[PDB]
Amino acid sequence: QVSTQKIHYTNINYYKDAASNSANRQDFTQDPGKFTEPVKDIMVKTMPAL
Amino acid sequence: QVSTQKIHYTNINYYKDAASNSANRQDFTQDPGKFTEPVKDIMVKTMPAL
Amino acid sequence: QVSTQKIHYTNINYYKDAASNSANRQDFTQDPGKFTEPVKDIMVKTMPAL
Amino acid sequence: VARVADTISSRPTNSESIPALTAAETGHTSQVVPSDTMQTRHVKNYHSRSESSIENFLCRSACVYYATYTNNSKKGFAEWVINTRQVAQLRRKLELFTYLRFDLELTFVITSAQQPSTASSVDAPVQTHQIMYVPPGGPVPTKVKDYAWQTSTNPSVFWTEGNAPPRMSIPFISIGNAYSCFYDGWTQFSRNGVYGINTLNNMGTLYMRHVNEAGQGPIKSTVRIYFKPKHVKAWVPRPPRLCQYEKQKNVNFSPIGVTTSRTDIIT
Amino acid sequence: SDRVRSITLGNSTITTQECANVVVGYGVWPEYLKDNEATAEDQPTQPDVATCRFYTLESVQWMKNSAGWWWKLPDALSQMGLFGQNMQYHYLGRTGYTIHVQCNASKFHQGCLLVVCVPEAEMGCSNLNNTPEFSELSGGDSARMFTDTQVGESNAKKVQTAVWNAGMGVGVGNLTIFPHQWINLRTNNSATLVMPYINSVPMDNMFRHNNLTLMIIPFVPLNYSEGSSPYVPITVTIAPMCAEYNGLRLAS
Amino acid sequence: LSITTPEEMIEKAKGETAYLPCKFTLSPEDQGPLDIEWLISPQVIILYSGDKIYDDYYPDLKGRVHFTSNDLKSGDASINVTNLQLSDIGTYQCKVKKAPGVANKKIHLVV
Amino acid sequence: LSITTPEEMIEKAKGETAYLPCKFTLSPEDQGPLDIEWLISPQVIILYSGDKIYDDYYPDLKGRVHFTSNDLKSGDASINVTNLQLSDIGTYQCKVKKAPGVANKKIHLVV
Amino acid sequence: GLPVMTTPGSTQFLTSDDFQSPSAMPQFDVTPEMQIPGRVNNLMEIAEVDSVVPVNNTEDNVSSLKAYQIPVQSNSDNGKQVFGFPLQPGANNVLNRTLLGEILNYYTHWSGSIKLTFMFCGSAMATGKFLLAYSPPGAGVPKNRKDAMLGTHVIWDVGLQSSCVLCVPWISQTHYRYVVEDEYTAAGYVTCWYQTNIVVPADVQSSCDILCFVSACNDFSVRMLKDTPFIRQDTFY
Amino acid sequence: GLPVMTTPGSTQFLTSDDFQSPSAMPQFDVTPEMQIPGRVNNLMEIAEVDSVVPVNNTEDNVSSLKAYQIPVQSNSDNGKQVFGFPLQPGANNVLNRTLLGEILNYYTHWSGSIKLTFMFCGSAMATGKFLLAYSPPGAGVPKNRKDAMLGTHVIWDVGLQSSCVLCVPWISQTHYRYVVEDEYTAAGYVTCWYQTNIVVPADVQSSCDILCFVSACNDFSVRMLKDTPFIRQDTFY
Amino acid sequence: FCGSAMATGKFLLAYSPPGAGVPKNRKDAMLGTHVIWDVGLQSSCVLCVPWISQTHYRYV
C-alpha cells in the first residue's frame, strides 16, 4: 500500500480487477547472464578462452 | 505526514516520484558565518582587529 | 480535529498556513465586568451606593 | 522557527575594549550590535525571517514567453526553445545566483480569439489544443498536417477550452550538477565562435497546434507559459544586474551611471 | 605580533612584515577530489611540488589617472613552466589558487585598492550585436585594463571597459559580496586570498573556461606631493594548490 | 544556431576577391532541415535548399559568386565574391534557418 | 493623492500677484508617472507631463502664469498669477493624476 | 460513487499556490549533487555584506568612480558639515543601488537596525576627529554641530585602526516601515561633522577621502514580497 | 456532501500519466503465462550484445557486405593508419545503425564506458601487431603513430587467440553526454596504426581483413527518453 | 637593508640550480627557489640555499 518513491507515497486500489491498477514502474531487475554469456562451460576472465 | 503550520495540518503524497511533491516552504536555516567572517583567524569583537 | 456541533463533526486542515483555516464560530466567552462595572471599589447590589 | 536575536541590556562602561573601531581592510564585515555603543533595554524580539528564504523568494510563477498561431493557415503552429533569458522580470531574479538547481512546474494559459470571418452564420464548437515537448535531438514537425505529431512517444498534453489550465512537472534535467546562469569561456577548443553559450541548460523545444480543422472562419489563439522553480538551492551569490539588458544570448549593455543624482552632497 | 605572515608552498616562500589577515574563499580550504564526487573513469595524476608554488606575473604601473586591471585566472599561468605544461597534455583538471597581490608605498602617499576575485566573470562587448574576441579578453600573464571613458560604438569586437560598471553591467560598488580585501596604503601593504575550486562540474577543461577573474579597481586614486616617488608598481603572484589532471593526449 | 559575428565592416580594393564569411555552430535542440540564404540591399543572390544550390537570381552577379567549402552542412555559408566593381556596395544578410533556430549576419561591404 | 484644501475663496486686488496654491502628499500605493493640469471656467492653461512643461495654451494668459517651486515632484503645483485684471474671474481646477490616484482643487478666484 | 461538492475557488490558477502535479518524465534519475562552496540559504545572508555607498552623486560625479569618494580637506574654520542624507533604505537616491537596496526593493516591510562602516582612506601622517550623528525624525535636519550632537552620535578618532561603525538603532513606533517614500514612517537623518580640523605635516596632500559602507545588524527582517520598479521591458529579446 | 476544490491541471490528458481506469470487460480471466525462454527485463540487456560496425562505408562499400571488412594488407613502409572515426555513439555515421545505436537513439543522455572487440579474420600463418589508440578530445585527430601512442592505447598481438578488447574509458567532465552531434561534449577519436607490418609466407594471400564489434560495459546507463529520428511516415498503411 | 627609516620595497632573492645559463628575466628566476622579501620593522631575510647535488660532496 504505502511505499517509497524516487520520503513515502500512498496508493489505494479502488476497482475490483487487475488490469485496472496503475503502471508498476518499479520492477528493477536485470540478468544479462543469458544474453552475454550463453555458453555451456563457464568462461573465466583472466585465463585465456582456449 | 502531519506537521505544524504558521495547530496542525495534514499532507499526503500521491504520485510515485519526487519532483511531484509540493514546495517545502519550511527549510528555515541560515549560516552567514561564511559570508560575513570568511577569515582564517577568529576575530573577537571587543579586542582590536590588529 | 473532531469536535461537537450545535452528535459530532470532523475537520481536517489541508494547507500549511494559519490564515487559510475556516472561521472559528465557536469562541463563546464574555466578560462585561469591564464595561458595566468599571469602578475601583466593589459595589454590592443590596447596600446603597453611598 | 528562524527567529531573530533579541537585544540585551547594557550599562555605561568605561574600559579598554572598543567594539566600534575595527579594520575594514581585512574584508571582514563588522559584527557589532547596538547594545555595544549605547544603552539598550532588553527587548524580546518575535520577528521571523521565514518570508525571506529562498523557496519563499523564487517559488512564484512568472510568464516566460507567449506566441500566437492562426487556425486557417498552413503551418499555423508555434515553436519555442526553452530558456529563461527572454523575459526580464524573471531573468533578474535568476542572475542573483550563479549555480541554481531546481525542478520545474509549467503552466499554460491558452486563449482564443475569433478572426474577421467572411461567411455568414459562423459557429464553431469548443477547441482542443496540443502542446508537444521535443527533447533536444528528437525529430521536429514541419507542418500541422504531419505524422510526427500523433505517432510519437514524447510527453504531450491535450487540453480543451473552458477548463482549468494544464500543468505538468519537470524534474532536474541537466548534464552537470546545477544550471549555470553564467558561463565565461568559449565552446570550441580553438576559442572561436559564440562566447557565452552552454549545453548544460538546454531543455528542448515546445511545439503547439490546433487539433480541430478549419470549419468556416479562422481562429487565432495564444498560449502563455509560466515557470515555478521548486526544491531550489542556490550557490555563489552575485550582485544584481544594473544596466538594461539588450540581447537574450550574451550580457551586452550600454554604460549608465550608478545611481540617480541629487543637487548637493549635504541635502 | 599579529601583523606578520609567512606563507610557503613547494619551494617558494612569501614573507610580509605589514599585512592584514588572510581571507579564505567561502569558508572552505582547497583539497583534492573525494571519491563520492569523482566522475573520470581513470586515475588522475598529482605533481604536487612541480606546480604548487608561487608564480609571479608581470608588473603594472599605478599612475594617478589609472582605471583598473583584470587577469583571467586559469589562463594567466598558461606559460609558467610545469603548470602550463601539464595544462596542455591533459584534458581535464581542477585547482585551487592562493592569490597574493602586493603594492608598497611610503607613509606620505595615499590611495586604496579593491582586490576582488569574481568567479565566472562574463564580460560584455562594445557592440551590442557582437561578442569580445579572445585576444582582447585576456592576455598571457599580462594585465588588460579598464578605462574611465565609455568605449565608442563603431568598434567591432572589443570590451566595454567603463569602470563604473565593472565591465559586467553590474554596479561597481556591489562587488564586495565576493571574497575580497582592500589594499589601503595607510595601514595595509598586501592582500591575500585563498580561492577553492568553484564550478558546477567536478573537473573541466582549462583552455576553454576561465572560471575566475582577479580584478583591481582603485577607488581612492593615488596621490602624493612633489618630491616623493612618482612610480608605484603593483605585482600579483598566484600559486595553485591541490592540482590534479586527467585524460592524457597529444600536445595541442 | 549562432553566427560568430552578426555584423562587421569589410574593406577591399576594386578588382580583388571579396571574402564575406558566414560561420555558425549547431546547438543540440536543432534537428530540422537546412536552409541558407543571401540578401543584398543597394533580393536573393544564392540559395541552398534541400542540399542543392539555386543561384541564378541576381542578373548583375552571374557566376561572380559561389560558395567556398565542400561541407556546407558543417557551418560554412561563406561566398567567394570575385572581381569587385563599384556597383557592389550594399549590406548583405546571411540568413540561415534550421528548424527551429534562426541566425543572421549583416555584412556591410564598402569599396 | 490628497489636496490640502479641495476648495476655498481667495481675494486679491487688481494689479497684484495672485497666489493659487496646490499642495499634496503621496500615499504609499502611488508609484506611477506624474501629471499635473490646470483648468479655468469663465480649458487647459499649463501642463506638466513627462517632467517637462507645456504652457502655451491660453492666449489671454501668455507668460502671466508659471509654476513657483523647483521641486514640482514633491507636492507643489502652485502657480504665480501676475498682474491681475478684470477678465480673470473664474473657477480653477488643479487636477493632478498620479497612477492610480487622483485629486483636484477648486480655486474660485474673485476680484 | 463518493458524493462531493465543489467550493468556490475551483478551476482557477493562483500565481502563488503550492500543489502537487503529474510528472512529465517518470522515473527520471537526477544527477547526484556536489558540495559546491558558497551555499546561500536565506537572502539575509546578503544584507550582512558591506557595500560602498554612492554618497557623492552631485549630478556629475555619478558617471564615474567619484560617486563613492567623500571630500575631506583641511578646513580653516571649525564645525563644518561633511555630508548628510535621509535614511530611507528603499526610497532614497543614495542607499538605493547598494547591496542592501536591491534586496529591500523586492519586499515592502522591513525592520531591524543598520550599521554604517566608515574607512578613512587618507594619508599615513594625517589625523582628525569626526562626529557621526543620527537624528531621529520629528524636527528638520540638524544645521549646527551644536544641534546634531543632541541626538545619537559617536566621536570618531583616526589612528592605527581605520574604521568606526555607527550603528543606527531601531527607534520607531511601528513594528515595521515601508520601503516606498512615505511621510508617516520617516526614519530620521544622518550627518557627519568636523570635530577637529584635518591637520597634516608638510609635503603631504591636504585633500583626503573617505569611503562609507552599509549593512544590516543581526535582527533584520523583511516581509510582503513584491517586484522591483527598476527593470523594464517592451518586447522579448 | 464533502467539500472539494479542483486544482489547475484537471480535465487534461497527459501523454505519460499513470492512473487507474474502469475495466471494459470485468472478470476476464487471462490465460496463464508460460516460461518462454529469453526474457528481456531491461533494455541494457541489449547494449551488452556485440554487433559488427560498418566502418568501411566509402560511399560504395555501403550497399554490400563490404562495409564491415577493414582492409589490411602487407604494407611496404612502416607506421600507416588503418582506420579512424570520431566516437559519438548516437550522432556519428558509423556507430549509428549498430545495436548500440538504435538503443541510444531513443534516449538523450548516456554514460559509461564502451568496449571495442576486434577479430582478425585473416589467414592462419600470418602475424602482425596493431596499435589501437583512443585520444581524448581537446586537440585535433592524431596524425602520426608517434602522436596517438601518447593517449590511451593497447598494442595488439595476433596469435592463437583472435581478439583484443580496447575498452574506451569514461573520461568526461559531465556526468552524461548528449547523443546528438554537439561540440561542448565531444568524446575524442579512435585510431588504429600498424605496429609492425603484416608478413606472410609464400602462396598465401597478403590481403587480409578485420572485423570490429561494439558494446557497453557493466556501468552503462541512459536517460530522458525520446523518439527516434529515423522512421518517417506520410499516410497510414 | 641599511637604508632610511621611511622607505619600503620588496626584493626577490632567487637561487637557480645549474643546468641552464643564468636567469635573465624576473619571469625566469622566479621559477627556481626564491623568497619574496619584504622590508618592515625587521631588517633581514635569510635565503638558505639548499643542498641539491648528485654527489655527496663538491670540489672547492
UniProtKB/TrEMBL annotation, chains A, B, C:
Superkingdom of the organism of origin: Viruses
- Protein's cellular compartments: Host cell; Virion
Question: Which family does this protein fall into?
Answer: Belongs to the picornaviruses polyprotein family.
Q: What is this protein's function?
A: Component of immature procapsids, which is cleaved into capsid proteins VP4 and VP2 after maturation. Allows the capsid to remain inactive before the maturation step. Lies on the inner surface of the capsid shell. After binding to the host receptor, the capsid undergoes conformational changes. Capsid protein VP4 is released, Capsid protein VP1 N-terminus is externalized, and together, they shape a pore in the host membrane through which the viral genome is translocated into the host cell cytoplasm.
- Subunit description: Interacts with capsid protein VP1 and capsid protein VP3 to form heterotrimeric protomers.
Name by which UniProt lists this protein: Genome polyprotein
Q: What phylogenetic lineage does the species belong to?
A: Viruses, Riboviria, Orthornavirae, Pisuviricota, Pisoniviricetes
From-to range in the entire protein, with total length: 4 to 68 of 141
TrEMBL record, chain D:
Task: Tell me the Gene3D superfamilies matching this sequence.
Answer: 2.60.120.20
Q: Which residues form a coiled coil?
A: none
Segments spanning the bilayer are none
* Subcellular location, principal: host cell
| Gene Ontology MF terms | structural molecule activity
Q: Which GO terms describe its biological process?
A: symbiont entry into host cell; virion attachment to host cell
Give the SUPFAM superfamilies listed for this entry. Answer: Positive stranded ssRNA viruses
GO cellular component assignments: host cell; viral capsid
Query: What is the protein name given in its UniProt record?
Result: Genome polyprotein
Q: Where is the protein localized?
A: Host cell; Virion
Q: Which domain of life is it from?
A: Viruses
Q: Where is the Picornavirus capsid domain?
A: 35-201
UniProtKB/TrEMBL annotation, chain E:
Q: Where in the cell is it found?
A: Host cytoplasmic vesicle membrane; Host nucleus; Virion
Q: Which domain of life is it from?
A: Viruses
* Its biological purpose: Plays an essential role in the virus replication cycle by acting as a viroporin. Creates a pore in the host endoplasmic reticulum and as a consequence releases Ca2+ in the cytoplasm of infected cell. In turn, high levels of cytoplasmic calcium may trigger membrane trafficking and transport of viral ER-associated proteins to viroplasms, sites of viral genome replication.
Which protein family is it in? Belongs to the picornaviruses polyprotein family.
Subunit structure comment from the entry: Homodimer. Interacts with host GBF1. Interacts (via GOLD domain) with host ACBD3 (via GOLD domain); this interaction allows the formation of a viral protein 3A/ACBD3 heterotetramer with a 2:2 stoichiometry, which will stimulate the recruitment of host PI4KB in order to synthesize PI4P at the viral RNA replication sites.
Protein name as it appears in the record? Genome polyprotein
Say which residues of the entire protein are included here.
79 to 330 of 2183
From TrEMBL, chain J:
Cellular location(s): Host cytoplasmic vesicle membrane; Host nucleus; Virion
**Which family is it part of?**
Belongs to the picornaviruses polyprotein family.
Q: What does this protein do?
A: RNA-directed RNA polymerase: Replicates the viral genomic RNA on the surface of intracellular membranes. May form linear arrays of subunits that propagate along a strong head-to-tail interaction called interface-I. Covalently attaches UMP to a tyrosine of VPg, which is used to prime RNA synthesis. The positive stranded RNA genome is first replicated at virus induced membranous vesicles, creating a dsRNA genomic replication form. This dsRNA is then used as template to synthesize positive stranded RNA genomes. ss(+)RNA genomes are either translated, replicated or encapsidated. Protein 2B: Plays an essential role in the virus replication cycle by acting as a viroporin. Creates a pore in the host reticulum endoplasmic and as a consequence releases Ca2+ in the cytoplasm of infected cell. In turn, high levels of cytoplasmic calcium may trigger membrane trafficking and transport of viral ER-associated proteins to viroplasms, sites of viral genome replication.
Protein name per Swiss-Prot or TrEMBL: Genome polyprotein
Report the source organism. Answer: Coxsackievirus B1
> What stretch of the parent protein is included here?
452 to 511 of 2182
